[PDB]
Each structure stands twice: as C-alpha cells, then as structure tokens.
Amino acid sequence: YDIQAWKKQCEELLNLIFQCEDSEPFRQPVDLLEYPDYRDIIDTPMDFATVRETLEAGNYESPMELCKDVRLIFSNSKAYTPSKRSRIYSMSLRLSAFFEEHISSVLSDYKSALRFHKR
Numbered sequence: 001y002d003i004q005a006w007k008k009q010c011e012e013l014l015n016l017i018f019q020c021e022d023s024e025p026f027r028q029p030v031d032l033l034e035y036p037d038y039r040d041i042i043d044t045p046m047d048f049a050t051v052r053e054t055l056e057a058g059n060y061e062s063p064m065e066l067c068k069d070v071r072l073i074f075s076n077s078k079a080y081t082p083s084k085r086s087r088i089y090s091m092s093l094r095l096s097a098f099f100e101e102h103i104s105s106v107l108s109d110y111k112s113a114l115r116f117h118k119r
C-alpha cells in the first residue's frame, strides 16, 4: 500500500526500455531536420528522454500520467507511419507490448494503495 512506490518502479521500467534495442527511434525527440513535416501531423511530440526528465523533475503526480505520455510515443509513431514497411513502427509495437506487460502491476498497485489510503 505504498502510495509513492510507482516512481521507482517507473524509473526501473524506463531503464529496461532504454536497454531495449527497440527503443532506439524513441530515446530522444524526433529531429525536425530529418522529418520536416513532423509537426504538421503530430500535435504533441513525446519521447522516452522527455518522460524520464518529467519523472525526475517531480512533474508526474501518478503513474497514469506517465502511462499517457508513453502511450503518446506509440500513437505518434502509428500516426506518422506511411505503411508496415517501417522498422520504426514495428519497433514501436514490440516496445508497446513490453511496456504494457510491465506497467499493468504498477498501475494496479498504485490504484490499490490510493483506495487503501481512503478506506
């Protein structure tokens, strides 16, 4: 029932994601010199270094907010991909499966801890 435990659990999951070769396209903001129309399609760029910096600055209040930003990394790639003949989109799908598999207990434990706090 530790209400704060999610933060270190998310730091560890982010470390696992950076170790994954599938995170390579998502470890830093998309370069607009490489993808000049990126902001014409993507309203809110997001990447794993930005998520980690937001977490470390103490600017997430819950793992649900972190999860929303991570899910935006994947939805941005889906929106920006022209077809399945994309190593980057295929990496996003595997990485998303890995993230969802690991974030589920973080979210459940946090929500359980908050319910216990207001029992």
Ligand SMILES: COCc1nnc(N)s1
Binding pocket: 025, 026, 030, 035, 076, 077, 078, 080, 081, 082, 086, 088, 089
């Ligand atoms: C992550 O770099 C920008 C891109 N996003 N989806 C692509 N298929 S290329």
